């Protein structure tokens, strides 16, 4: 098979076989990749190995072709010649191949292992045809990384809403939420096959799982749970289609009596309809979930494809569009496997309807008039290229706040990925600025909202309320035990229970923590309804309690701090460890 | 295929790829053309590209004929030999190709873009084969200029009688008149197929076009239009069939007392019979287009095909024939679309009738006994070749005058074209002289002819009427509105409207102005029959109102103004702009 070189797009028929993705490489580019790095295996229309009865040489700098094969020096004929010479590696289209140096970064893209921080930061500022390749090889690396994993089963039948967990000894265990799903294996005597996928979550105390189910087929101990995995297909569409402006709005025809509800965004609705792709960053709780409904009511007859990275955001958007938009011309596209407790309220799963809501992973190849991508902070470059490949539409609108939490990004372990390089769209939003940005905030008290607009934001936020005089911030040591994979702060709950008796308000509070172990133990001794810092960001509460366990760069991440303190509305007790975290904000002392 | 070189008529098998018309060229002539100009692509029976796995070399001095195909410098089989060398280019009939220098005029003809004026004066004074090749490439360039136009679309439809227009952003907009047609698309998903043949014209108010269609399809907003192309056929037949002088009339027969009205042109009828083709040149309204009908009455058995380049001229000829010839044996041949409204009083579209009237473009392949081409000023060499190809004949008669207005020549924008280069027939008329010549004025009054014998003709015409004093020359500034890319003079039209209710005998005067935009838009404000100067030629009216729209080189053209005024029969009012032009004529006061 022939194709296009990755870094010069000339015709070629080589491939770097040692790479995870096996990218096409033109002659001069292939020589520059093999003489520099440690990849010495090149695949042409036939692999470049030693075709002897007995010999196995893979290196291409040490292969000489002869007759109709390739041998090393011990097995070559009286005739020559080097496969890799004159600056080129012998392949198809030998004289249409233009070299391109930008191999000095293609080496660092192809040879890195993504463990350090800088690999992402230089896998995102490179050119487009390398923006795609870096994303592809990153996904391949993650998929192969999920092939080295721990394995459990269910101890015994324990509850109808909860199972238990019997893991193997000597291997790590994953995080537990709707993102990480798990598979049962039925190797019983007798023919390992699948019965259904269960997602797992930590139990009350000791060892337990409170889960989410896929299939009703109830196993005995005869099944054991693995992670589950899949192939990564190659991506072709660019991350962002080129920005072309339009004079007057095209293919979008404004409405009659939109509403008196969101008529202050009419300028922003038309600025959405003007360009090819628009970018709207709205501070937490400023109406972007409501702006999508307003945009759909400003161009009433345009089919709109709403999309998002995860089921939570798209389901909240679905509920809002049921509450505001017309209901019968709605279509939520569900996965066939149904890995989640999906949303069945609409007339579900008809891809030839008008308001089509879907997740990025489950988008079917179709067309639209304007597609609204939501939560671009969550989305990786793979999701952006996927949504540009599967969906062609007259307009694209990316909405989301980079100040919220990023994607999981599991491989990253050393250093902090700053927001700017979350993906291409967040880089756009920080380089030149979001095209639209709505700054008020309808949840938080006065001091916190002014100071959060003064924390990181360029001072654009305000509150239409008065401060509830029930937000606090303490500095109690909260001695650490941490004798588990995450850090815990129990005697901090001791100090908070030394309060909370003179404060009868938050007696239905939701507990949050920067650590899942302390969150898990906080739901044990007192039945506080818990919702971790990640599981927030999309809901509002009026009673929430948040404690700090440690002091580190994971304790001062102002994205996490901003996503934390903005889920309460009238009352929050909170524990600050570092004097940095008691002084960027104004609250009472106690 | 095997063909004949254009400039030497030797045998050849080569063609020039870069040339629009792809003309055959012998070996010597092809070498002379390619080694000196920028054309470097030569098509033999197989094209001369390099036959590597993938290689793109077209320059002929780079190539070799190696092995069994054409290969470039470093792809050739080790056995050569050079293609473009030894003063020749290797092709079939290699050692029989002998040409001539005219490889200095052919370079200019092939290279020139037909923008200047000298390209036409070199395309009409060259040798006879180049007179055909230059006309062919000129028609090809005129066709390929339409490829640079902007394709439309529909905004909406409030009124179904007046379409709304929307041009593509970033391309020029074609003028809106009868000459240009359009054909649509519906490219949404869902039928990238034509939707009919439409045509446009502007509206006075706002933005609107009061369209017309060949069918009655509506445009759902995605449907749109593109101006249609036209491949140009080889200029197969010579521009003028070579003349032979017979001793006596062959193929034609006289008549018994032809009439008492045509008794003067008998000698010219006999001269027409003697020669193969004849040319009749006369000042307008002297008996030219009536001479042809007299010829028909003099050769009653002879089947005759009348033709002209315009429609409104052949319609006038049709009316005259109805007045004189027996109406039973006539016809009228109309094109399939029939953009203009043609003459429907004869048995329309029956080619095999004795007297058949048609435009040049819609001529059907047939025979005749004498073919009468009329108004050769309107005709270019393409029309002469077309009429000489489709219609075989025994005798040809070309009637027309050079001092009338020539063909449009939209590409020409620098300098002026003298009469003797309008086409081959006008060149013959001005060089050696017409074969038949008749001159005097029998139509226009004494005043207008006594002024036009000062503008264009050097005090040659006496005439016959009495100056009725109904010849008026107006002074009016006439402010400019360059609206449709053809000017509109609203205050001059206002002058006319305010003094057309003061003239009870002028309620039916035809409105003449050089610009089609004002001439078309005048229909609402005064309601008179309207006519442009270019199509008014050849038709007479009892009263004319002429309005010099704007001062330019188009409306202050003495030929155009002279063919404009002399269509009056008893009186004409004209409002003028140029302080000279109003002064060179001698009319009444106002």
């Amino acid at each position: 098979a022939v194709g296009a070189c990755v870094l010069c797009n000339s015709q070629t028929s080589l491939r770097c076989g040692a790479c995870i993705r096996r990218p096409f490489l033109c002659c001069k580019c292939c020589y520059d990749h093999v003489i520099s790095t440690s990849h010495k295996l090149v695949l042409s229309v036939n692999p470049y190995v030693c075709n002897a009865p007995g010999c196995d040489v893979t290196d291409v700098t040490q292969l000489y072709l002869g007759g109709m094969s390739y041998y090393c020096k011990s097995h070559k004929p009286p005739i020559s010649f080097p496969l890799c010479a004159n600056g080129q590696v012998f392949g198809l289209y030998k004289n249409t191949c233009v070299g391109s140096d930008n191999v000095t970064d293609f080496n660092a893209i192809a040879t890195c292992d993504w463990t350090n921080a800088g690999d992402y930061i230089l896998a995102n500022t490179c050119t487009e045809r390398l923006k795609l390749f870096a994303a592809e090889t990153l996904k391949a690396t993650e998929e192969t990384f999920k092939l080295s994993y721990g394995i459990a089963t269910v101890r015994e039948v324990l509850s109808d809403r909860e199972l238990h967990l019997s893991w193997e000894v000597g291997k790590p265990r994953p995080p537990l939420n709707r993102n990480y799903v798990f598979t049962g294996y039925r190797v019983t005597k007798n023919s390992k096959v699948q019965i259904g996928e269960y997602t797992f979550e930590k139990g009350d105390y000791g060892d337990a799982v409170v889960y989410r189910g896929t299939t009703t087929y109830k196993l005995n101990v005869g099944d054991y749970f693995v992670l589950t995995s899949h192939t990564v297909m190659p991506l072709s569409a660019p991350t962002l289609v080129p920005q072309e402006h339009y004079v007057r709005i095209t293919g979008l025809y404004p409405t009659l009596n939109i509403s008196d509800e969101f008529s202050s965004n009419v300028a922003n609705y038309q600025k959405v309809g003007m360009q090819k792709y628009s970018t709207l960053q709205g501070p937490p709780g400023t109406g972007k979930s409501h702006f999508a409904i307003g945009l759909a009511l400003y161009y009433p007859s345009a089919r709109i494809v709403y999309t998002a990275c995860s089921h939570a955001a798209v389901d909240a958007l679905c509920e809002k569009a049921l509450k505001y938009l017309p209901i019968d011309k709605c279509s939520r596209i569900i996965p066939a496997r149904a890995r989640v407790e999906c949303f069945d309220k609409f007339k579900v799963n008809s891809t030839l309807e008008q308001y089509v809501f879907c997740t990025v992973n489950a988008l079917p190849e179709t067309t639209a008039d304007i597609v609204v991508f939501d939560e671009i902070s969550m989305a990786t470059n793979y999701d952006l290229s996927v949504v540009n490949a599967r969906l062609r539409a007259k307009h694209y609108v990316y909405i989301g706040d980079p100040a919220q939490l990023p994607a999981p990004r599991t491989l990253l372990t050393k250093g902090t990925l700053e927001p700017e390089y979350f993906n291409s769209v967040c880089r756009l939003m920080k380089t030149i600025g979001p095209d639209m940005f709505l700054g008020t905030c309808r949840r938080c008290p006065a001091e916190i909202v002014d100071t959060v607009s003064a924390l990181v934001y360029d001072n654009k936020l305000k509150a239409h309320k008065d401060k509830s005089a029930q937000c606090f911030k303490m500095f109690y040591k909260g001695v650490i035990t941490h004798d588990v994979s995450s850090a815990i702060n129990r005697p901090q709950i001791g100090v908070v229970r030394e309060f909370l008796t003179r404060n009868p308000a938050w007696r239905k509070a939701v507990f949050i923590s920067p650590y899942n172990s302390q969150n898990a133990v906080a739901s044990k001794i007192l039945g506080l309804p818990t919702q971790t810092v990640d599981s927030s960001q999309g809901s509002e509460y009026d009673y929430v309690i948040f404690t700090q366990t440690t002091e580190t760069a994971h304790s001062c991440n102002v994205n996490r701090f901003n996503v934390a303190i903005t889920r309460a509305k009238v009352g929050i007790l909170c524990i600050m460890s570092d004097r940095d975290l008691y002084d960027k904000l104004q609250f009472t002392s106690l | 295929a095997v063909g004949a070189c254009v400039l030497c008529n030797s045998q050849t098998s080569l063609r020039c790829g870069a040339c629009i018309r792809r003309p055959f060229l012998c070996c010597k002539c092809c070498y002379d053309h390619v080694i000196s100009t920028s054309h470097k692509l030569v098509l033999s029976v197989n094209p001369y590209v390099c036959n590597a796995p993938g290689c793109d070399v077209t320059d002929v001095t780079q190539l070799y004929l190696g092995g069994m195909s054409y290969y470039c410098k470093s792809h050739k089989p080790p056995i050569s030999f050079p293609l473009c060398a030894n003063g020749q280019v290797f092709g079939l009939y290699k050692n029989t190709c002998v040409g001539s220098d005219n490889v200095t005029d052919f370079n200019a003809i092939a290279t020139c873009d037909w923008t200047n004026a000298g390209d036409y004066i070199l395309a009409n004074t060259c040798t006879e084969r180049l007179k055909l090749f230059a006309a062919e490439t000129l028609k090809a360039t005129e066709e390929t200029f339409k490829l640079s136009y902007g394709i439309a679309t529909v905004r909406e439809v409030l009124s179904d009688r007046e379409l709304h227009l929307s041009w593509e952003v970033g391309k020029p907009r074609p003028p809106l008149n009868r000459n240009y047609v359009f054909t649509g698309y519906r490219v949404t998903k869902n039928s990238k197929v034509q939707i009919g043949e439409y045509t446009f014209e502007k509206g006075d108010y706002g933005d609107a076009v009061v369209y017309r269609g060949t069918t009655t399809y509506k445009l759902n907003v995605g449907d749109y239009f593109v101006l249609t192309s036209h491949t140009v056929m080889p200029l197969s037949a010579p521009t003028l069939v070579p003349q032979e002088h017979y001793v006596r009339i062959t193929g034609l027969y006289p008549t018994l007392n032809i009439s008492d009205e045509f008794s003067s042109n008998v000698a010219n009828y006999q001269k027409v019979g003697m020669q193969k083709y004849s040319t009749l040149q006369g000042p307008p309204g002297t008996g030219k287009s009536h001479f042809a009908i007299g010829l028909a009455l003099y050769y009653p058995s002879a089947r005759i095909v009348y033709t002209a380049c315009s429609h409104a001229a052949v319609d006038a000829l049709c009316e005259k024939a109805l007045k004189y010839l027996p109406i039973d044996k006539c016809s009228r041949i109309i094109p399939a679309r029939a953009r203009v409204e043609c003459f429907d009083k004869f048995k329309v579209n029956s080619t095999l009738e004795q007297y058949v009237f048609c435009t040049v473009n819609a001529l059907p392949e047939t025979t005749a006994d004498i073919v009468v081409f009329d108004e050769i000023s309107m005709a270019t060499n393409y029309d002469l070749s077309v009429v000489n190809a489709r219609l075989r004949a025994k005798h040809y008669v070309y009637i027309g005058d050079p001092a009338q207005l020539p063909a449009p020549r939209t590409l020409l924008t620098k300098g002026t074209l003298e009469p003797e280069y309008f086409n081959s027939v006008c060149r013959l008329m001005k060089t050696i002289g017409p074969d038949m010549f008749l001159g005097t004025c029998r139509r226009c009054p004494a005043e207008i002819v006594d002024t036009v014998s000062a503008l264009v003709y050097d005090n040659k015409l006496k005439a016959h009427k009495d100056k009725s004093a109904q010849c008026f020359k107006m002074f009016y500034k006439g402010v400019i509105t360059h609206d449709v890319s053809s000017a509109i003079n609203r205050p001059q039209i206002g002058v006319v409207r305010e003094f057309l209710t003061r003239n009870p005998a002028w309620r039916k005067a035809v409105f003449i102005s050089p610009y089609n935009s004002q001439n078309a838009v005048a229909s609402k404000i005064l309601g008179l029959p309207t006519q442009t100067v270019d199509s008014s030629q050849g038709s007479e009216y009892d009263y004319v109102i002429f309005t010099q729209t704007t001062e330019t080189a188009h409306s202050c053209n003495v030929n155009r103004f002279n063919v404009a005024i002399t269509r009056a029969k008893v009186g004409i009012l004209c409002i003028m702009s140029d302080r000279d032009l109003y002064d060179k004529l001698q009319f009444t006061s106002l």
Binding site: - | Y93, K94, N95, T96
Partner: protein
């Protein structure tokens, strides 16, 4: 596994002496590929054997016709030549005889194939060749039976069928004779043991099969090309009924082919110096070549003239483009020069003179299209009769 297969019916665009349309069977590649892989070793082994009964792969040039005719006359006692016809051969062939031919061809797989392997190969042959789906004008019909002329083993299975019918005719001829009238005591015992081995024996008697094969080779020598057959039988035995005659072939084809073989298409030649009347559409004549007399095949002069006059393409009409076309036809028409009829001998000279005229006008046109003659021209040997005389001389 059994793979059923669709075979197309293709109309044949070729020159013929009768106006009935001819159709060939285009069999699928999925059948042709596997049938090649199954049968091609034996099929190439048959085509490479000289001097056998089945003359496939034997050229008629360089003395190949004379060698064939000398092997047919393999020491028969009172030789008469005989040739018969199979009316509607490919469409009236019974399915039992086609299965018989396929099983005879598959006897070579006694070590490479198992019993079930050979059965499923036979079943694939029947499903793809014998009784298949036929595409005839965009419509699928069912073929009732009979061989299709497009399978990999068509000529060879046809040869097996031809030999089977000839052996059956000899068996019927020998058994339907009286037995009290047979004077030769050896043939009477041969008839007795033939009846025993037919209807009183269920196990193969290889000794008698060899004995009857020797009898047939001695008295009924054959030459088979897939439906053409020349026999050089003993005329005295055939008159006494001990060896098959034309009437025995007529009887066998009546009760075993469901056709009537009229004796107007079957010839008998009592004089061996004239050779077979017709074999593979070629007549035979005995000529003095060099110093010895040999058998040369000549075609119908009408066939060669029709091939010259009528073509299946518009560019075969130019002549100068196709001089090899007429060189091949003159190669085929050379033996007509030895015919006693002068109008037959003039066809070869006509072709040679047309080759010379074609080369003359080709060189004229080439010299016109250029101004130089070709440097190397070896076309002069194609209007010399020695190039064609050497085509029938046994040195190669």
């Amino acid at each position: 596994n059994v793979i059923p297969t669709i075979t197309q019916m293709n109309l044949k665009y070729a020159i013929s002496a009768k106006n009935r349309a001819r159709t060939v069977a285009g069999v699928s590649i999925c059948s042709t590929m596997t049938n090649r892989q199954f049968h091609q070793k034996l099929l190439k082994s048959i085509a490479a054997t000289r001097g056998a009964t089945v003359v496939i792969g034997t050229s008629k040039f360089y003395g190949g016709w004379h060698n064939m005719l000398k092997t047919v006359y393999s020491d028969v006692e009172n030789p008469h030549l005989m040739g018969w016809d199979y009316p509607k051969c490919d469409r009236a062939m019974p399915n039992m005889l086609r299965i018989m031919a396929s099983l005879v061809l598959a006897r070579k797989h006694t070590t490479c194939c198992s019993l079930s392997h050979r059965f499923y190969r036979l079943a694939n042959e029947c499903a793809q060749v014998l009784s298949e789906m036929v595409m005839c004008g965009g419509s699928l019909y069912v073929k009732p039976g009979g061989t299709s002329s497009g399978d990999a083993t068509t000529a060879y299975a046809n040869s097996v069928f031809n030999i089977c019918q000839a052996v059956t005719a000899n068996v019927n001829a020998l058994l339907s004779t009286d037995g009290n009238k047979i004077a030769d005591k050896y043939v009477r015992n041969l008839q007795h043991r033939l009846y025993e081995c037919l209807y009183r024996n269920r196990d193969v008697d290889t000794d008698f099969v060899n004995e009857f094969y020797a009898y047939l080779r001695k008295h009924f020598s054959m030459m088979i090309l897939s439906d053409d057959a020349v026999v050089c039988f003993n005329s005295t035995y055939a008159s006494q009924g001990l060896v098959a005659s034309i009437k025995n072939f007529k009887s066998v084809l009546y009760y075993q082919n469901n056709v009537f073989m009229s004796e107007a298409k079957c010839w008998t030649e009592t004089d061996l110096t004239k050779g077979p009347h017709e074999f593979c559409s070629q007549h035979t004549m005995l000529v003095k070549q060099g110093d010895d007399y040999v058998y040369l095949p000549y075609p119908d002069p009408s066939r060669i003239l029709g091939a010259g006059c009528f073509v299946d393409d518009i560019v075969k009409t130019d002549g100068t483009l196709m001089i090899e076309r007429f060189v091949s036809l003159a190669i085929d028409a050379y033996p007509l020069t030895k015919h006693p009829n002068q109008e037959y001998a003039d066809v070869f000279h006509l072709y040679l003179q047309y080759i010379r005229k074609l080369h003359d006008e080709l060189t004229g046109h080439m010299l016109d299209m250029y101004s130089v003659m070709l440097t190397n021209d070896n076309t002069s040997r194609y209007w010399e009769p020695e190039f064609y005389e050497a085509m029938y001389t046994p040195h190669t």
